[PDB]
Design a protein around this motif. Structure first.
Motif, mmCIF file in Angstrom:
data_model
loop_
_atom_site.group_PDB
_atom_site.id
_atom_site.type_symbol
_atom_site.label_atom_id
_atom_site.label_comp_id
_atom_site.label_asym_id
_atom_site.label_seq_id
_atom_site.Cartn_x
_atom_site.Cartn_y
_atom_site.Cartn_z
ATOM 1 N N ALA A 1 0.819 -1.209 0.000
ATOM 2 C CA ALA A 1 0.000 0.000 0.000
ATOM 3 C C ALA A 1 0.866 1.278 0.000
ATOM 4 C CB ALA A 1 -0.948 -0.064 1.205
ATOM 5 N N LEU A 2 1.983 1.285 0.739
ATOM 6 C CA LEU A 2 2.912 2.415 0.823
ATOM 7 C C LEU A 2 3.857 2.516 -0.380
ATOM 8 C CD1 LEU A 2 2.060 1.688 3.981
ATOM 9 C CD2 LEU A 2 3.711 3.462 4.418
ATOM 10 N N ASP B 1 7.975 5.065 -3.714
ATOM 11 C CA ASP B 1 8.309 5.514 -5.070
ATOM 12 C C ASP B 1 8.738 6.994 -5.082
ATOM 13 O OD1 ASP B 1 8.330 5.854 -7.916
ATOM 14 O OD2 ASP B 1 6.229 5.321 -8.180
ATOM 15 N N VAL B 2 8.055 7.858 -4.330
ATOM 16 C CA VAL B 2 8.433 9.275 -4.177
ATOM 17 C C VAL B 2 9.779 9.471 -3.482
ATOM 18 C CG1 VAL B 2 7.688 11.470 -3.051
ATOM 19 C CG2 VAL B 2 6.113 10.112 -4.400
ATOM 20 N N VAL B 3 10.160 8.613 -2.535
ATOM 21 C CA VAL B 3 11.513 8.635 -1.955
ATOM 22 C C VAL B 3 12.536 8.113 -2.955
ATOM 23 C CG1 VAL B 3 12.987 7.690 -0.106
ATOM 24 C CG2 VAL B 3 10.759 8.575 0.442
ATOM 25 N N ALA C 1 17.310 10.399 -8.878
ATOM 26 C CA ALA C 1 17.649 11.652 -9.538
ATOM 27 C C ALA C 1 18.938 12.262 -8.979
ATOM 28 C CB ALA C 1 16.464 12.607 -9.416
ATOM 29 N N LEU C 2 19.130 12.293 -7.659
ATOM 30 C CA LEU C 2 20.381 12.761 -7.054
ATOM 31 C C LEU C 2 21.566 11.842 -7.376
ATOM 32 C CD1 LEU C 2 18.782 13.926 -3.729
ATOM 33 C CD2 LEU C 2 20.045 15.415 -5.224
#
Lengths: 49, 49
Positions: B2-3, B8-10, B16-17
Motif C-alpha cells: 500500500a505504501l 516511489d516518491v523517496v 535523480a540525485l
C-alpha cells in the motif's frame, strides 16, 4: 612593439605561448587583440664575425 | 505494498540525485573528467577549450 629575434623563437610571440622570449623578454596578454608581423632580416641584421 | 506510493516518491528523488552526481564522472568528449587533470596536461588555451 619592435625587436629582433631568432627565427625559431618567433613561434613564442603569440597569446598563451611559453619559452625563453615569451617567459623572460616579451609576454603577450592571454586575451591579446592585435597582430604579430614578422620577416627574416638576415641581409641587415647579420654581420661578419 | 500500500505504501508503494510514498516509497516511489523517496526512490525517485534518490535516483535523480544519484544520476546528477554520477554525471560528474562523464567526459562529454573532453580529455578527462577531472579539472586538475585537464589543467595539468595542457596549454591553457587548449585546457580552456
Amino acid at each position: 612593439d619592435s625587436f629582433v629575434i631568432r627565427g625559431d623563437e618567433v613561434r613564442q610571440i603569440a597569446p598563451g605561448q611559453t619559452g625563453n622570449i615569451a617567459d623572460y623578454n616579451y609576454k603577450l596578454p592571454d586575451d591579446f587583440t592585435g597582430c604579430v608581423i614578422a620577416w627574416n632580416s638576415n641581409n641587415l641584421d647579420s654581420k661578419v664575425g | 505494498s500500500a505504501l508503494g506510493k510514498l516509497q516511489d516518491v523517496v526512490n525517485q528523488n534518490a535516483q535523480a540525485l544519484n544520476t546528477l552526481v554520477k554525471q560528474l564522472s562523464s567526459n562529454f568528449g573532453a580529455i578527462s573528467s577531472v579539472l586538475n587533470d585537464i589543467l595539468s596536461r595542457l596549454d591553457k588555451v587548449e585546457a580552456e577549450v
